[PDB]
Protein backbone atom coordinates (compact mmCIF):
# COMPACT_ATOMS: atom_id res chain seq x y z
CA UNK A 1 0.00 0.00 0.00
CA UNK A 2 2.83 2.43 0.81
CA UNK A 3 4.60 1.84 -2.51
CA UNK A 4 1.28 2.16 -4.35
CA UNK A 5 0.43 5.46 -2.65
CA UNK A 6 3.78 7.08 -3.48
CA UNK A 7 3.82 5.57 -7.01
CA UNK A 8 7.52 4.77 -6.63
CA UNK A 9 7.65 1.95 -9.19
CA UNK A 10 5.74 3.80 -11.90
CA UNK A 11 7.75 6.98 -11.32
CA UNK A 12 11.04 5.09 -11.59
CA UNK A 13 9.83 3.31 -14.74
CA UNK A 14 8.85 6.62 -16.34
CA UNK A 15 12.18 8.19 -15.36
CA UNK A 16 14.04 5.24 -16.89
CA UNK A 17 11.97 5.48 -20.07
CA UNK A 18 12.73 9.20 -20.35
CA UNK A 19 16.48 8.75 -19.83
CA UNK A 20 17.16 5.26 -21.17
CA UNK A 21 19.04 3.53 -18.36
CA UNK A 22 18.41 0.30 -16.48
CA UNK A 23 15.68 0.20 -13.85
CA UNK A 24 18.20 -0.71 -11.14
CA UNK A 25 20.52 2.16 -12.09
CA UNK A 26 17.74 4.68 -11.40
CA UNK A 27 18.24 4.44 -7.63
CA UNK A 28 21.61 2.65 -7.42
CA UNK A 29 23.59 5.20 -9.45
CA UNK A 30 23.98 8.97 -9.15
CA UNK A 31 23.11 11.89 -11.39
CA UNK A 32 26.10 11.69 -13.75
CA UNK A 33 24.83 8.46 -15.31
CA UNK A 34 21.64 10.06 -16.64
CA UNK A 35 23.31 13.11 -18.17
CA UNK A 36 26.02 10.88 -19.65
CA UNK A 37 23.38 8.61 -21.19
CA UNK A 38 21.73 11.72 -22.66
CA UNK A 39 24.88 13.29 -24.11
CA UNK A 40 26.12 9.99 -25.55
CA UNK A 41 22.96 9.68 -27.64
CA UNK A 42 23.14 13.40 -28.45
CA UNK A 43 26.65 13.02 -29.86
CA UNK A 44 26.12 9.68 -31.60
CA UNK A 45 23.22 11.37 -33.39
CA UNK A 46 25.70 14.00 -34.64
CA UNK A 47 28.86 11.82 -34.83
CA UNK A 48 30.91 13.61 -32.19
CA UNK A 49 33.85 12.15 -30.25
CA UNK A 50 33.78 12.43 -26.47
CA UNK A 51 36.81 12.76 -24.21
CA UNK A 52 37.49 10.59 -21.15
CA UNK A 53 40.31 12.00 -19.01
CA UNK A 54 41.78 10.43 -15.88
CA UNK A 55 41.60 11.22 -12.19
CA UNK A 56 45.04 12.86 -12.24
CA UNK A 57 43.89 15.24 -14.99
CA UNK A 58 40.68 16.34 -13.26
CA UNK A 59 42.52 17.09 -10.01
CA UNK A 60 45.16 19.13 -11.88
CA UNK A 61 42.61 21.33 -13.67
CA UNK A 62 42.00 24.97 -12.78
CA UNK A 63 39.89 25.40 -9.66
CA UNK A 64 36.66 27.39 -9.55
CA UNK A 65 37.29 31.09 -8.94
CA UNK A 66 33.77 32.51 -9.43
CA UNK A 67 31.12 32.29 -6.71
CA UNK A 68 27.38 33.09 -6.92
CA UNK A 69 25.67 36.15 -5.43
CA UNK A 70 23.86 36.21 -2.09
CA UNK A 71 22.45 39.36 -0.47
CA UNK A 72 22.79 39.84 3.27
CA UNK A 73 19.23 40.57 4.45
CA UNK A 74 18.43 43.32 6.94
CA UNK A 75 17.07 41.32 9.88
CA UNK A 76 13.80 43.02 10.81
CA UNK A 77 10.05 42.46 11.04
CA UNK A 78 8.49 43.63 7.77
CA UNK A 79 4.82 44.60 8.04
CA UNK A 80 4.39 45.78 4.45
CA UNK A 81 3.97 43.30 1.59
CA UNK A 82 7.22 41.71 0.40
CA UNK A 83 7.03 40.81 -3.29
CA UNK A 84 9.00 37.66 -4.11
CA UNK A 85 10.39 37.40 -7.63
CA UNK A 86 12.06 34.16 -8.66
CA UNK A 87 13.61 32.87 -11.88
CA UNK A 88 12.68 29.46 -13.26
CA UNK A 89 15.48 27.19 -14.55
CA UNK A 90 18.06 29.97 -14.49
CA UNK A 91 21.07 27.80 -15.37
CA UNK A 92 19.40 25.91 -18.27
CA UNK A 93 18.07 29.23 -19.58
CA UNK A 94 21.58 30.66 -19.32
CA UNK A 95 22.98 27.69 -21.24
CA UNK A 96 20.31 28.00 -23.94
CA UNK A 97 20.45 31.76 -24.46
CA UNK A 98 24.21 32.33 -24.30
CA UNK A 99 25.11 29.09 -26.14
CA UNK A 100 27.53 27.59 -23.62
CA UNK A 101 28.82 24.03 -24.06
CA UNK A 102 31.96 22.01 -24.76
CA UNK A 103 31.51 22.09 -28.55
CA UNK A 104 31.24 25.90 -28.66
CA UNK A 105 33.97 26.87 -26.18
CA UNK A 106 36.99 28.32 -28.00
CA UNK A 107 39.30 29.37 -25.17
CA UNK A 108 40.18 32.01 -22.63
CA UNK A 109 40.30 35.61 -23.80
CA UNK A 110 43.81 36.00 -22.36
CA UNK A 111 46.88 33.93 -23.25
CA UNK A 112 45.54 32.91 -26.67
CA UNK A 113 48.43 30.87 -28.03
CA UNK A 114 48.64 29.04 -31.36
CA UNK A 115 50.00 25.68 -30.12
CA UNK A 116 49.70 25.41 -26.31
CA UNK A 117 46.10 26.22 -25.36
CA UNK A 118 44.50 24.98 -22.14
CA UNK A 119 40.77 24.60 -21.46
CA UNK A 120 39.49 22.61 -18.49
CA UNK A 121 41.48 19.37 -18.33
CA UNK A 122 42.64 19.22 -21.95
CA UNK A 123 45.15 20.86 -24.27
CA UNK A 124 44.63 21.95 -27.87
CA UNK A 125 45.90 24.32 -30.56
CA UNK A 126 43.91 27.02 -32.33
CA UNK A 127 43.82 27.27 -36.14
CA UNK A 128 45.61 29.95 -38.16
CA UNK A 129 42.78 32.24 -39.30
CA UNK A 130 39.87 31.22 -37.07
CA UNK A 131 39.72 34.36 -34.91
CA UNK A 132 39.81 36.75 -37.88
CA UNK A 133 36.91 34.80 -39.40
CA UNK A 134 34.77 34.35 -36.26
CA UNK A 135 35.31 37.84 -34.81
CA UNK A 136 31.66 38.57 -35.67
CA UNK A 137 29.86 35.43 -34.45
CA UNK A 138 31.17 35.27 -30.88
CA UNK A 139 29.70 36.05 -27.45
CA UNK A 140 32.52 36.72 -24.99
CA UNK A 141 31.71 35.55 -21.47
CA UNK A 142 32.43 37.71 -18.40
CA UNK A 143 34.69 34.95 -17.05
CA UNK A 144 36.88 35.38 -20.15
CA UNK A 145 35.92 32.32 -22.22
CA UNK A 146 34.98 32.75 -25.89
CA UNK A 147 31.88 31.01 -27.26
CA UNK A 148 30.62 30.65 -30.82
CA UNK A 149 27.33 32.26 -31.78
CA UNK A 150 24.12 30.34 -32.43
CA UNK A 151 24.35 31.19 -36.15
CA UNK A 152 27.48 29.12 -36.85
CA UNK A 153 26.85 26.17 -34.53
CA UNK A 154 23.94 25.17 -32.29
CA UNK A 155 24.82 23.61 -28.94
CA UNK A 156 23.77 20.04 -28.23
CA UNK A 157 23.21 20.87 -24.56
CA UNK A 158 20.92 23.67 -25.76
CA UNK A 159 18.96 21.08 -27.75
CA UNK A 160 18.42 18.80 -24.75
CA UNK A 161 17.57 21.74 -22.48
CA UNK A 162 15.02 23.25 -24.87
CA UNK A 163 13.48 19.81 -25.42
CA UNK A 164 13.14 19.33 -21.66
CA UNK A 165 11.63 22.80 -21.30
CA UNK A 166 9.15 22.52 -24.17
CA UNK A 167 7.92 19.05 -23.21
CA UNK A 168 7.64 20.36 -19.64
CA UNK A 169 5.45 23.30 -20.65
CA UNK A 170 3.47 20.98 -22.95
CA UNK A 171 2.79 18.62 -20.04
CA UNK A 172 1.86 21.56 -17.81
CA UNK A 173 -0.60 22.90 -20.39
CA UNK A 174 -2.08 19.44 -20.97
CA UNK A 175 -2.58 18.99 -17.23
CA UNK A 176 -4.03 22.48 -16.70
CA UNK A 177 -6.52 22.18 -19.58
CA UNK A 178 -8.40 19.05 -18.40
CA UNK A 179 -10.16 18.79 -15.05
CA UNK A 180 -12.66 15.97 -15.54
CA UNK A 181 -10.00 13.41 -16.50
CA UNK A 182 -9.36 10.45 -14.21
CA UNK A 183 -6.30 9.91 -12.03
CA UNK A 184 -4.55 7.82 -14.72
CA UNK A 185 -3.61 10.67 -17.07
CA UNK A 186 -2.92 12.95 -14.10
CA UNK A 187 -0.52 10.40 -12.59
CA UNK A 188 1.18 9.84 -15.96
CA UNK A 189 1.72 13.55 -16.60
CA UNK A 190 2.90 14.12 -13.03
CA UNK A 191 5.44 11.31 -13.38
CA UNK A 192 6.65 12.72 -16.70
CA UNK A 193 6.93 16.20 -15.17
CA UNK A 194 8.89 14.86 -12.20
CA UNK A 195 11.25 13.00 -14.55
CA UNK A 196 11.85 16.11 -16.66
CA UNK A 197 12.38 18.18 -13.51
CA UNK A 198 14.98 15.69 -12.27
CA UNK A 199 16.70 15.79 -15.67
CA UNK A 200 16.70 19.60 -15.85
CA UNK A 201 18.11 19.80 -12.33
CA UNK A 202 20.80 17.17 -12.93
CA UNK A 203 21.94 18.55 -16.31
CA UNK A 204 23.87 21.34 -14.57
CA UNK A 205 25.49 19.10 -11.95
CA UNK A 206 27.63 17.55 -14.71
CA UNK A 207 29.51 20.87 -14.99
CA UNK A 208 33.02 21.32 -13.53
CA UNK A 209 32.64 18.06 -11.56
CA UNK A 210 34.14 19.46 -8.36
CA UNK A 211 35.11 15.97 -7.19
CA UNK A 212 34.87 12.45 -8.63
CA UNK A 213 34.25 13.66 -12.17
CA UNK A 214 34.33 12.11 -15.62
CA UNK A 215 34.24 15.12 -17.96
CA UNK A 216 34.47 18.50 -16.18
CA UNK A 217 35.02 22.04 -17.42
CA UNK A 218 35.56 24.65 -14.71
CA UNK A 219 35.46 27.51 -17.22
CA UNK A 220 31.91 26.66 -18.32
CA UNK A 221 30.50 26.65 -14.79
CA UNK A 222 32.49 29.78 -13.92
CA UNK A 223 31.08 31.64 -16.92
CA UNK A 224 27.54 30.43 -16.15
CA UNK A 225 27.77 31.60 -12.53
CA UNK A 226 29.30 34.92 -13.60
CA UNK A 227 26.61 35.67 -16.18
CA UNK A 228 23.98 34.67 -13.63
CA UNK A 229 25.47 37.16 -11.17
CA UNK A 230 25.45 39.78 -13.93
CA UNK A 231 21.80 39.06 -14.75
CA UNK A 232 20.90 39.30 -11.06
CA UNK A 233 22.65 42.63 -10.56
CA UNK A 234 21.20 44.02 -13.80
CA UNK A 235 17.69 43.06 -12.68
CA UNK A 236 18.36 44.68 -9.30
CA UNK A 237 19.49 47.87 -11.03
CA UNK A 238 16.44 47.86 -13.31
CA UNK A 239 14.14 47.46 -10.30
CA UNK A 240 15.89 50.19 -8.30
CA UNK A 241 16.11 52.55 -11.31
CA UNK A 242 12.36 53.29 -11.41
CA UNK A 243 11.03 56.26 -9.45
CA UNK A 244 7.42 55.04 -9.71
CA UNK A 245 8.20 51.79 -7.85
CA UNK A 246 9.90 53.08 -4.70
CA UNK A 247 11.11 49.61 -3.73
CA UNK A 248 14.35 48.14 -2.40
CA UNK A 249 15.96 44.72 -2.79
CA UNK A 250 16.70 43.24 0.63
CA UNK A 251 17.31 39.53 0.03
CA UNK A 252 17.93 36.99 -2.72
CA UNK A 253 19.98 33.78 -3.06
CA UNK A 254 21.13 33.22 -6.66
CA UNK A 255 17.58 32.89 -8.02
CA UNK A 256 15.16 35.18 -6.13
CA UNK A 257 14.68 38.88 -5.42
CA UNK A 258 12.89 40.26 -2.35
CA UNK A 259 11.64 43.81 -2.95
CA UNK A 260 9.93 45.84 -0.23
CA UNK A 261 6.83 47.93 -0.97
CA UNK A 262 6.08 49.99 2.17
CA UNK A 263 2.29 50.14 2.55
CA UNK A 264 1.43 49.57 -1.10
CA UNK A 265 -2.14 48.20 -1.05
CA UNK A 266 -1.18 44.56 -1.60
CA UNK A 267 -4.11 44.06 -3.98
CA UNK A 268 -2.11 46.28 -6.35
CA UNK A 269 1.17 44.59 -5.41
CA UNK A 270 0.20 41.75 -7.76
CA UNK A 271 0.03 44.13 -10.72
CA UNK A 272 3.22 45.85 -9.55
CA UNK A 273 5.08 42.54 -9.52
CA UNK A 274 3.61 41.57 -12.88
CA UNK A 275 4.87 44.82 -14.42
CA UNK A 276 8.28 44.32 -12.79
CA UNK A 277 8.51 40.78 -14.19
CA UNK A 278 7.48 41.94 -17.66
CA UNK A 279 10.12 44.69 -17.57
CA UNK A 280 12.76 42.21 -16.41
CA UNK A 281 12.04 39.61 -19.09
CA UNK A 282 11.81 42.20 -21.86
CA UNK A 283 15.50 42.99 -21.20
CA UNK A 284 16.87 39.42 -21.38
CA UNK A 285 17.30 36.66 -24.01
CA UNK A 286 14.36 34.57 -25.15
CA UNK A 287 14.38 31.58 -22.72
CA UNK A 288 14.79 33.80 -19.65
CA UNK A 289 11.51 34.21 -17.76
CA UNK A 290 10.86 35.74 -14.34
CA UNK A 291 8.09 34.28 -12.17
CA UNK A 292 6.04 36.25 -9.64
CA UNK A 293 4.17 33.30 -8.12
CA UNK A 294 3.60 34.66 -4.59
CA UNK A 295 3.40 37.59 -2.18
CA UNK A 296 4.53 37.88 1.45
CA UNK A 297 2.42 40.41 3.35
CA UNK A 298 4.02 39.58 6.73
CA UNK A 299 7.67 38.59 6.76
CA UNK A 300 10.45 37.89 9.26
CA UNK A 301 13.91 37.65 7.66
CA UNK A 302 16.10 36.01 10.30
CA UNK A 303 19.24 35.40 8.22
CA UNK A 304 20.40 33.90 4.92
CA UNK A 305 18.03 31.08 3.92
CA UNK A 306 16.24 31.64 7.25
CA UNK A 307 12.82 33.29 6.95
CA UNK A 308 9.12 32.67 7.51
Amino acid sequence: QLLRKQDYIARNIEQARLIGIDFHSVYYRGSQFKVESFLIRICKSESFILLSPGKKDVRKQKALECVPLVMEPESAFYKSPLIVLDFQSLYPSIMIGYNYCYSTMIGRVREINLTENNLGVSKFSLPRNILALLKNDVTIAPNGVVYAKTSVRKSTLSKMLTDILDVRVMIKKTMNEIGDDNTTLKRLLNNKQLALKLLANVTYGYTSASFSGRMPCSDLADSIVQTGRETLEKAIDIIEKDETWNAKVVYGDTDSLFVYLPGKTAIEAFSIGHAMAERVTQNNPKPIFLKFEKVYHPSILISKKRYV
Binding site: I13, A16, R17, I19, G20, I21, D22, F23, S25, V26, F33, E36, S37, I40, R41, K44, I49, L50, L51, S52, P53, G54, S122, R214, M215
Partner: peptide, 24 residues
Protein backbone atom coordinates in the same frame (compact mmCIF):
# COMPACT_ATOMS: atom_id res chain seq x y z
CA UNK B 1 47.62 9.21 -25.60
CA UNK B 2 44.24 10.73 -24.81
CA UNK B 3 41.41 8.26 -24.20
CA UNK B 4 38.07 8.75 -25.96
CA UNK B 5 34.74 7.10 -25.08
CA UNK B 6 36.14 5.10 -22.16
CA UNK B 7 34.09 6.30 -19.17
CA UNK B 8 30.88 5.02 -20.80
CA UNK B 9 30.12 1.45 -19.64
CA UNK B 10 29.49 -1.43 -22.01
CA UNK B 11 25.74 -1.64 -21.36
CA UNK B 12 25.31 2.10 -21.98
CA UNK B 13 27.27 1.93 -25.24
CA UNK B 14 25.16 -1.04 -26.33
CA UNK B 15 21.80 0.54 -25.51
CA UNK B 16 22.91 3.85 -27.09
CA UNK B 17 24.61 2.57 -30.31
CA UNK B 18 21.36 0.75 -31.23
CA UNK B 19 18.78 3.34 -29.97
CA UNK B 20 17.28 1.18 -27.17
CA UNK B 21 16.02 2.54 -23.77
CA UNK B 22 15.22 1.11 -20.31
CA UNK B 23 11.74 -0.30 -19.67
CA UNK B 24 11.01 0.09 -23.40
Amino acid sequence: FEIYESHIPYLLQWTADFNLFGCS
